[PDB]
Amino acid sequence: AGSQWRLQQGFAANPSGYGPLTELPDWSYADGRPAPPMKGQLRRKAQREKFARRVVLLSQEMDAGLQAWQLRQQEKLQEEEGKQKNALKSKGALLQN
Amino acid sequence: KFTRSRIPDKVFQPSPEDHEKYGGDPQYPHKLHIVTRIKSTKRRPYWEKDIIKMLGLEKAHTPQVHKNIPSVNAKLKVVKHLIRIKPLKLPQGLPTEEDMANTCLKSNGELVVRWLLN
Amino acid sequence: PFLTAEQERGHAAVRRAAAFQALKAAQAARFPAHRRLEEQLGHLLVTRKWS
Amino acid sequence: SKNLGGKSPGKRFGIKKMEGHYVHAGNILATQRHFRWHPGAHVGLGKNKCLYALEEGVVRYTKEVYVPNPSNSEAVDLVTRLPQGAVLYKTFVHVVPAKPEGTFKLVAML
RNA sequence: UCGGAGUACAAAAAACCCUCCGAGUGAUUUUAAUCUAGACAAACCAGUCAAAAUAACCAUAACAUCACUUAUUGAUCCAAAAUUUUGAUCAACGGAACAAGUUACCCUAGGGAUAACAGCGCAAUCCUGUUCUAGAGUUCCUAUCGACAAUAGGGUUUACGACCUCGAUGUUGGAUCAGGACACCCAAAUGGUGCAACCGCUAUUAAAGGUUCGUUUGUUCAACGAUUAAAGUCCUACGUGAUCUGAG
RNA sequence: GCCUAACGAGCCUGGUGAUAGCUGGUUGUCCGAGAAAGAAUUUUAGUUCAACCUUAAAAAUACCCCAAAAACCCUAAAUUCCAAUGUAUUUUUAAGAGAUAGUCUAAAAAGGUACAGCUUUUUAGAAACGGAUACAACCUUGACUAGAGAGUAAAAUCUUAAUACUACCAUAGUAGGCCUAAAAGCAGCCAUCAAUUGAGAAAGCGUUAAAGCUCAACAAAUUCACCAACAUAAUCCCAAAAACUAAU
RNA sequence: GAUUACCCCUUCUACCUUUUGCAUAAUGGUUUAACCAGAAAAAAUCUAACAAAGAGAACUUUAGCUAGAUACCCCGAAACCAG
Ligand SMILES: Nc1nc2c(ncn2[C@@H]2O[C@H](COP(=O)(O)O)[C@@H](O)[C@H]2O)c(=O)[nH]1
Ligand SMILES: Nc1nc2c(ncn2[C@@H]2O[C@H](COP(=O)(O)O)[C@@H](O)[C@H]2O)c(=O)[nH]1
Ligand SMILES: [Mg+2]
Ligand SMILES: [Mg+2]
Ligand SMILES: [Mg+2]
Ligand SMILES: [Mg+2]
Ligand SMILES: [Mg+2]
Ligand SMILES: [Mg+2]
Ligand SMILES: [Mg+2]
Ligand SMILES: [Mg+2]
Ligand SMILES: [Mg+2]
Ligand SMILES: [Mg+2]
Ligand SMILES: [Mg+2]
Ligand SMILES: [Mg+2]
Ligand SMILES: [Mg+2]
Ligand SMILES: [Mg+2]
Ligand SMILES: [Mg+2]
Ligand SMILES: [Mg+2]
Ligand SMILES: [Mg+2]
Ligand SMILES: [Mg+2]
Ligand SMILES: [Mg+2]
Ligand SMILES: [Mg+2]
Ligand SMILES: [Mg+2]
Ligand SMILES: [Mg+2]
Ligand SMILES: [Mg+2]
Ligand SMILES: [Mg+2]
Ligand SMILES: [Mg+2]
Ligand SMILES: [Mg+2]
Ligand SMILES: [Mg+2]
Ligand SMILES: [Mg+2]
Ligand SMILES: [Mg+2]
Ligand SMILES: [Mg+2]
Ligand SMILES: [Mg+2]
Ligand SMILES: [Mg+2]
Ligand SMILES: [Mg+2]
Ligand SMILES: [Mg+2]
Ligand SMILES: [Mg+2]
Ligand SMILES: [Mg+2]
Ligand SMILES: [Mg+2]
Ligand SMILES: [Mg+2]
C-alpha cells in the first residue's frame, strides 16, 4: 500500500496516478515509429487542460475584481475631492473677520 | 429538532501557531482552494447534499479548484466535514497558453507547468 | 479569505449572465429536425436487385 | 371526555411582505389578531387589524414613538401613568413610494 | 360543527378518547349603499381585507358598537311568500326527502390490517437479593425481624402493546412419560444463635436420587383423614389430545 | 323438525358474463425518469382534489443566500425574506395516471409506568452485493460492462475484578452538685474547675449500684493508610487461542 | 468460482402474491403438454391533405377543418325474481 509514504514523497497515493508507469506509452512498433495515443491518456490530457484553463480563469477573475474595487475606491476619492473643488468661496462669517 | 448549524466566529480565528502547524503564510492568504470530497453525502441532510452538488464535488476523490472568496467559503464551511481543502500552489506561475496541454496537479498541491517534457 | 465581502461584490457577474444566456439559447434551440428527400427516398433501396 | 372543542385551524395570522419587498397598491402587508405591527406612511388599516399598502413602493419596518389618540381612554391612562422619562415605542410598517405621482406630457401645439 | 391559550419557546402549517376556557347569541342606535384596482387564505366549496369613483348627512367620519369579539353557524334541490325574500339540534353540523332490535339456526368475501390460547417486548403488578438504621428484641440495629428510603436482577400472576400465525398454532383438568433450573422439601458438609440436651430459628455449599394413599369438588387450588425422610417452587406452546379422556 | 343423502327454507332452468371498495391471477427483451400521504367523504379495506412524479412545449430566472428587517412580561436549537457568489435549475402550457392502510434511528414534545419491537405531532436520515459474527431502519458508499491490476472507507477481543493497622501506661480533690433503693466518668438535669512534667467531673464496653476492660494524656518510636468491593432459570458452555521482533 | 480432477475448498436465507417488513413455520404450486386474462378515440399528442376555410349532405370555424395512429382485464360468492 504505502499511500501515506507516497503522499509524503510527493507521488500519487495510487501508483496509477500521473506516474511514469501510466503516462508513458506502453508499446511501440519494432520499426521505431510511435504507436497511436491511448484513449485514457487523451482523456486525462483533456481533463488536465480543462483544470488548467479553469485555474487561469479563476485567477484572472480574482485579479480583475480586486482591480475594479481599487478603481472604485480611487474614483470615490477623486469625486470626494471634486465635490470640494467645485464648491464656492464662503462669505458669511469670513467677510467680517 | 435537527436543523442546520451556525458555526461561531471564534472557530475560524486562526492561532499564531496554526500558521506554522499547517504551513500557511501569516501575512498573505492563499488565492485558490483545491477541494476534494472524501465522505459520501448519504446519511447527510439535503442542504449538505445540494451544497456538494453545486460545488461540483459530486464525484469523490476528484480535486476541484475554487476561489478563496467568502461567498464560496460559506458553502465550504457548511460542508467542511465532507471535504479536504488545500491551497493551490504555483511554483512556476500560472500556466501560459503555450503550456496548457503539458500541465499536471500533484497530490501535494503544486500545479506543475511543464510535466514530462519530451 | 483572499478578497473581502465588499471586494467580491459583482467581481464575476458578466460571466454568470453570459452562462445563463447560453443556457437560455440552448433551451430555445429546441425544435423538430429537418425532413429531407434522401430519408424518404432511401427506403426504396430495400428492393435493389441484380439485373 | 371532559375537554372538547380544542380543535381549530390556524388563522395564518402573520407577516406577508417583509422589508425591501416591492408591493403594489392594495397588497396585504401583514395580518394580525392583536396590534403587533402598526401602520405608518402609506399603510392603511383594515377593520380586522390587517395592514395594506396604499401606494406602490418598498416595504420598510421602523421603531418609532407612539402618541395615541387623545380619545383613546385606555392608552391615555397608560400615558398619564408613565413616568417622566419614559416614551412608548412601537414597530411601524411603512411603504416608501417609488413611482412619481405623474408626468407632464406635451399633447398639442396651439 | 365553530373559536381562544398550551402542546406548537422566534414566518406559516401541524395530530392524539391530550390539558383548560367557551358558541349555537343578547343589549343599544350611528339601521351600516352601489361599483371596482390590488391582495390574504385556500384541494374544491366556501371565508376575508380593500384604494379610487358615485347619491344623502358634518359641507372634517360613516369600519355599527359592547359582552376576552375571536366563535354566535348549514350547500344544492325543493317548498312557501309578492318577485323580494324566507325556510332545517339536515348538531352524524360538506348535510341520503322519508328506515329499529336480534341471530348460539346463521351464511358469504376477507383480515393476523383486528380480539380470545400460545409465543414475543416492558416489568405497572409479582418474585428475589443486597445498601441505610430509626424501632421491636429487658439493656443490645443486624439471634429473628425491621417502617420511611436506595439500588440491582428474574420473567411464575394480572394487566399493558398488537409483532408471527384467522386458504386453522385445536382449550382447562386428569392418565402415561417425563427433560431442565435452583430461588433445596428430604437426604449430605458446615457458620451464628436470645444454641445447656431433644425440638427449633436463620445463612453458606451441593440438583446423582426421591418428593404417598384417600373423602368432597370438572377442578388447578382449597378443607379434611392416615402416613412419611420429605409430601419443594417453577420452566418446558400455563410440557405432552397424528399417545388417551371430554368431567368443565 | 321433515318435504329424494347440503332446507332459517327444495331442486332445475332463465334473468346471468347478477354484483362485489373483498381475495387470487394477469403471458417477450432492453433502455430513461420515478413517487410513503394535507382536505373532504355512512369515510378512514375506497374514491375526488391539492402537494409530489412522468411525457411533450414555451419561456426566465431558479436553489445557496452577508447586511438590514419580523411584539408586546423571560425565553434554546433555529426559522421567514433577501444581494453577492457556486451551480443549472425553476415557473407556466397540454396530457395524465399511481399513492393517499409505513418501519426504525437521531432530535423537540405529549399520553403511559420519566414501560415497551407502545401510541400521536415537527426536523433530518436510511432501507449494500462492505462492516456491526447472523441482522430493515446503525456505520462506510455520486449503484453500467470485461480484466488472473492498484489505492482507500467503515470496521475485527471493551474498562477495572480493590478496603489489615499491632505496642504504651493510665494515679488525684471526688462517690462534683441534685433526683433516686442505689446513680462512684457513664436513667437523667446543671456545672465541666482543680493536683501533678503529663490524664475529659469522661469518648465507648461492663455492674442493680461498685468493680473491672478500653480510648484520648504524658512518657517510646514513629514505611503507607478519606470514601471506594453487591446471587440467581430453566435442551448443551460457547470460535480456538494469545500479556512484547518495532504499527499513523 | 473454479480445478489435472465428479465430490472434497470458498460464497449465496427458493420463486410469485401480500405487507412497514417474509428463508420465514404467511398464500399458491408434484410434473409435462394444450388452452386461460386490457376492450372504447370526448378533450389531447404525432403524421399528413386543404387552408379563412375544411369535410363526397346535414357540421365546425377569431388557424381552422378532414383523415390515420396512439385507451381503458380474467376467475369467485352468500344472495334476489319468474316459471
Ligand atoms: N325545512 C326544509 N326542508 C327541506 C329543505 N330542502 C329539502 N327539504 C325537505 O323537504 C321536506 C319537507 O317536509 P316537511 O318537513 O315540511 O314535512 C323534507 O323531506 C325535507 O328534508 C329545506 O331547505 N328546508
Ligand atoms: N405509497 C408508496 N408506496 C411505495 C413507495 N415506494 C415503494 N412503495 C411500495 O413498497 C413496496 C415495495 O417496497 P420497496 O421495493 O420499495 O422496498 C410496494 O408495495 C410499493 O408499492 C412510495 O414511495 N410510496
Ligand atoms: Mg475508465
Ligand atoms: Mg388550537
Ligand atoms: Mg386542525
Ligand atoms: Mg398565498
Ligand atoms: Mg373611498
Ligand atoms: Mg357524517
Ligand atoms: Mg362531516
Ligand atoms: Mg371545514
Ligand atoms: Mg339455545
Ligand atoms: Mg366464512
Ligand atoms: Mg396498519
Ligand atoms: Mg391470558
Ligand atoms: Mg397453545
Ligand atoms: Mg397474548
Ligand atoms: Mg407461535
Ligand atoms: Mg408493560
Ligand atoms: Mg427487569
Ligand atoms: Mg429498644
Ligand atoms: Mg413464559
Ligand atoms: Mg398483528
Ligand atoms: Mg401500530
Ligand atoms: Mg388464528
Ligand atoms: Mg397452509
Ligand atoms: Mg423429572
Ligand atoms: Mg444454592
Ligand atoms: Mg437437611
Ligand atoms: Mg430433582
Ligand atoms: Mg402463561
Ligand atoms: Mg398445555
Ligand atoms: Mg402433540
Ligand atoms: Mg389436554
Ligand atoms: Mg385421537
Ligand atoms: Mg360435556
Ligand atoms: Mg335435497
Ligand atoms: Mg365479477
Ligand atoms: Mg372500503
Ligand atoms: Mg434507471
Ligand atoms: Mg390525482
Ligand SMILES: [Mg+2]
Ligand atoms: Mg440575513
Ligand SMILES: [Mg+2]
Ligand atoms: Mg434571491
Ligand SMILES: [Mg+2]
Ligand atoms: Mg387507504
Ligand SMILES: [Mg+2]
Ligand atoms: Mg411503532
Ligand SMILES: [Mg+2]
Ligand atoms: Mg420523514
Ligand SMILES: [Mg+2]
Ligand atoms: Mg425508497
Ligand SMILES: [Mg+2]
Ligand atoms: Mg453478509
Ligand SMILES: [Mg+2]
Ligand atoms: Mg452509492
Ligand SMILES: [Mg+2]
Ligand atoms: Mg496538670
Ligand SMILES: [Mg+2]
Ligand atoms: Mg491512650
Ligand SMILES: [Mg+2]
Ligand atoms: Mg443465594
Ligand SMILES: [Mg+2]
Ligand atoms: Mg431476511
Ligand SMILES: [Mg+2]
Ligand atoms: Mg403495497
Ligand SMILES: [Mg+2]
Ligand atoms: Mg403484518
Ligand SMILES: [Mg+2]
Ligand atoms: Mg416465523
Ligand SMILES: [Mg+2]
Ligand atoms: Mg411470516
